[PDB]
Design a protein around this ligand. Sequence first.
Ligand SMILES: NC(=[NH2+])c1ccc2[nH]c(-c3cccc(-c4ccccc4)c3[O-])cc2c1
Ligand SMILES: [Ca+2]
Ligand SMILES: [Cl-]
Length: 223
Amino acid sequence: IVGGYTCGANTVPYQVSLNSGYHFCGGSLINSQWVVSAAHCYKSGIQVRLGEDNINVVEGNEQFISASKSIVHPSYNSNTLNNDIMLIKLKSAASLNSRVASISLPTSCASAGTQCLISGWGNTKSSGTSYPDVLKCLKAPILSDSSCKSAYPGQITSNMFCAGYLEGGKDSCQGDSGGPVVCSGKLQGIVSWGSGCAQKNKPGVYTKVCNYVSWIKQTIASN
Ligand SMILES: NC(=[NH2+])c1ccc2[nH]c(-c3cccc(-c4ccccc4)c3[O-])cc2c1
Ligand SMILES: [Ca+2]
Ligand SMILES: [Cl-]
């Protein structure tokens, strides 16, 4: 997260770190046995780490659970990143409490202007790599479809939305992919891609979760 602030330990209880010996992506806990992340974060050997703040220190509240299966959306396109969503089923359910909680899926899509919270352990520099130990947060608004399409002509599908600041300075970045974009208590997006990080007129692009709720529900109900 570039231009954000330190969240404060366990203030984002639905945030998870996907780990394979190092942190490579974020994700969101939506119930006690399922996590939603981005399809491009898929790999084998995933350990899901819940209740984290400093990802390099066991401070207490952590729960490390292996993924039993990861379900990449069947129409995921790795060239356009269209349908960049994945569901991960945990080997055992997690113990929910005030430090580990799930986030609700939305019933409707959000409108431009909506203020959301984006978080993660990704790079905090736009020009260079500085990875934090604790979780960073950024409050950012959803942009209108026209500004998004004018920024990325021909690359935005109906399953994506832009959020951020066109003046540059604040954005999600590498290491944040797969994580949450929460607006009014509902998970509206998943960190997907962007051109550089925090560059002028190149906002972050997110997977539009409201378009996949029936798919998430039906898939979880059958697995
Ligand atoms: N400007 C943004 N808003 C933004 C958001 C998420 C991002 N993720 C990345 C990213 C960069 C290199 C590798 C990965 C990656 C690749 C495979 C698996 C996991 C992460 C990224 O997600 C860049 C990147 C940029
Ligand atoms: Ca820790
Ligand atoms: Cl277009």
